[model samples]
Target: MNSRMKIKKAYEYMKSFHQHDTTGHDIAHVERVYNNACYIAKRENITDTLVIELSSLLHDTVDSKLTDEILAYDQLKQFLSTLDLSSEISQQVLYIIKHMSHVKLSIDGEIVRDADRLDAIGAIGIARTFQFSGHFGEPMWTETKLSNEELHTSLVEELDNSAIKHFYEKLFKLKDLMHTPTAKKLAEERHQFMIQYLKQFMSEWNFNK
Candidate 1:
């Protein structure tokens, strides 16, 4: 099978996997990440568009949060095997999918990671966060007199799981973590928007202005 056909198959698989998701890790999220990867690949001069796109489309398939990680991974590997991709290409895709969330990444991995992180911020990110909070029954924010340092520096595991805490724990940090210049530039505005959102959210929470 050709790479295009493989991509189509991957898309179908991803769509089915994410069809029922409502905590923002849905098929639309996969589509947006795929789009972001393609856009970044063009600017970064990445010619292996197939690898990036496949990685983006399938990245969340093995998410431990959503499914059985080992089982999903084995299933993904079996699915890729059926695509008739070169071993090199298959390994590359698997590597990106596996390491996309880690702090360090290859250039290809970076683009996919940036794309995924981009989806995790901005206006869409805010909606996703609240959606996730609602899905898990986590509160939007906890009313507490937290200091600035605590809010900014607390570890994600240390903080209570709440939508507002998610910003400090992860969302607020994504802009600086962007690897590609295009992704970094795109992140700036989105990052600022999140900041502005937090301010208004705090104001409303405090019943002030």
Candidate 2:
């Protein structure tokens, strides 16, 4: 009944954490994931989505590498403890936060994971990549000398440093990694969009008429 109140509290905490950050994992990013997770739950016919919703908003506050504040992971635990939440849900929220990267996930876990992965691709993902690249002093693009097929066969960490390399490294693979069918459909759409974007990007990068 009070999930809204709880969610709001969590959001304020999340906003404080990201208040000074625009590198990536900003509020808008998390909100998109929030909406995506909620919508995915709706399509999946999961009526009560309190867990997924809460997890979506607060997931990054505990883990943001871009954050300037010394907000340790312990702060997340203490902050959640202050909320008027049941012990069961409290543990659940913590569990999903801990393992939703790739897990024997709960329904809520899969939904939130897919939503997070969704934001990590497509146009939004592309924009965030270069912003993060700029923030970390990483180059925007580097010629890998690998053909498209070779890029597909390459591992992420084995490649050189550049945001474009990151696309080939991780972002391109999320389409197949999505678990929920709802997320998989959206992943396909976003993945195809990224493919076209990469084509246009390389076209401009290696410009000629």
Candidate 3:
């Protein structure tokens, strides 16, 4: 199959995999990450466009938060094998999907990672946070106060797991963790927006209205 045809098939496969998802890891999220990857690739002069796009499209196919991770990963492996891509390219795509979490990444992996992280920290990120919490029946925030020291130092396992705590723990850190200048620049405004949102949220919680 041609590269375009393979990408189309990947999208179809991703859509099927993420079908009926209400936890913010839906098709729209995949498309945005793909677009972000394309934009970052161009700016950063990345040449592995196929791997970037394919990785973005299928990034969340095996997200442990959304499904059975091992089975989904195996199914993804089978799906990619059918694309007729070179072994090198297929391996590159698979590697990105498998290792592109909060961990370190390769250059192409970095671009995809930044793109995916970008989708997790702006107005869109705020909406997704609440959406995910609602889906899983988690509260938006607890009444307890978390100091900056605590937020930065506490492991996720130790946190209260509310949406507000999520910002301090993960979402707020994404800007600095971004791997590309393009994503970093874009993240600045979004990061500030999230900070402002938290201020307002806490204000309301404290009856500052």
Error of 3 at 97 (Å): 1.5
User: Cα deviation in Å at residue 184, candidate 1?
Assistant: 0.7
Off by over 4 Å in 1: 20-25, 64-67, 101-103, 147-150, 155-161
Taking the tens digit of each residue's C-alpha lDDT, what string does model 3 give over 1-209?
A: 78889999999998888777775457888899999899999999986588899999998787755568888888988998899888889889888987864567778888998898899999999998897888788999875555756777655447666887788778887899887999999999999999899888877888844
Query: Worst 10-residue stretch by lDDT in candidate 3?
Result: 148-157
Best by lDDT: 1
lDDT of 1 by residue, 74-189 (tens): 88888888898888888888988878534577788889999988998999999988988998999999866676467888544566789988888888888898889999988998
Name the best candidate (by TM-score): 2
Q: Which stretches of candidate 2 lie over 4 Å from their true place?
A: 22-25, 64-73, 155-159
Candidate 2, overall lDDT?
A: 0.83
Quality of model 1 by C-alpha lDDT: 0.85
Residue pairs with clashing backbones, model 2 = none
Instruction: Name every residue pair that clashes in candidate 3.
Output: none
Model 1 Cα shift for residue 158 (angstroms): 7.5
Instruction: Write down the worst ten-residue block by lDDT for model 2.
Output: 63-72
